[PDB]
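agent> fetching stored inputs for the krypton docking request
agent> found them:
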Amino acid sequence: EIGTGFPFDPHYVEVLGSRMHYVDVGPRDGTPVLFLHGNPTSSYLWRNIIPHVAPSHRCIAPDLIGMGKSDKPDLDYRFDDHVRYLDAFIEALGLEEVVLVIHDWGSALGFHWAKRNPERVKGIAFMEFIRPIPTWDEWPEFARELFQAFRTPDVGRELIIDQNAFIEGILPKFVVRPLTEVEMDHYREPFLKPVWREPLWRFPNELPIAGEPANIWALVEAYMNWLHQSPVPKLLFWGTPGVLIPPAEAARLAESLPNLKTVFIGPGLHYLQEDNPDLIGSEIARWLPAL
Ligand SMILES: [Kr]
Ligand SMILES: [Kr]
Ligand SMILES: [Kr]
Ligand SMILES: [Kr]
Ligand SMILES: [Kr]
Ligand SMILES: [Kr]
Ligand SMILES: [Kr]
Ligand SMILES: [Kr]
Ligand SMILES: [Kr]
Ligand SMILES: [Kr]
Ligand SMILES: [Kr]
Ligand SMILES: [Kr]
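agent> prediction call returned; pasting tokens
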């Protein structure tokens, strides 16, 4: 029942000397809604959510540099590289004010951009987002040894680069319902060759867990501090048991963040868009008019 197609015409824009791909649908004026994916996905992740929003709002969904249909420049692919390319993507499209719809490393990018551009963010919808994880005990037990191995020298590259563990293992393991072969092939396409998989390994090595790495920890702490003091309208989707945002964390955010609406989506691990896209898309569409 969940759609497997990707019925969006490609759009491309030159960013810092590379081509970046993005979805661009909906009315051409008004406030645009910017959808940001994370690891190891692309705009494909938003395919069943955008159609709920496009009747009323411009929907823009870029593929991060090195991901989806975007180019693959010779970068480190550290978080700062993604910050630079997304910053330049937003300026290249001439976006002024935006609504953010963000997930995983797309949420680190979105929140970090919002903190630096607070007058330009009219609302933030988010789910399974990057926050400072205090201990490995807060990481789900069934994935703890794997993510520690991703962050272990040599071992992590063997798993993610050589064996494609993030696409073949983590992605289907972090969806409650079974992903279909058609969906897996969409997610596999940008990473068929090992030489393309550096972003997939860099991302877990940047996750802020138990204080490390210190630079990302401080950056994420900073935008969470901004979020806790910001009056911007906020919409959180959460599932059970979750991965980055377990129920107790969703509850804590419901108590501490200003101007927050929360929506429980039912069963969900990390890629909540793949378990209940209809609820996520319909609730975003209902929330946008209040902005
Ligand atoms: Kr993930
Ligand atoms: Kr990264
Ligand atoms: Kr981007
Ligand atoms: Kr952003
Ligand atoms: Kr995290
Ligand atoms: Kr976690
Ligand atoms: Kr896993
Ligand atoms: Kr690589
Ligand atoms: Kr994750
Ligand atoms: Kr709680
Ligand atoms: Kr909640
Ligand atoms: Kr709280």
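agent> quick read of the result: The longest helix spans residues 214-229.
agent> awaiting further instructions
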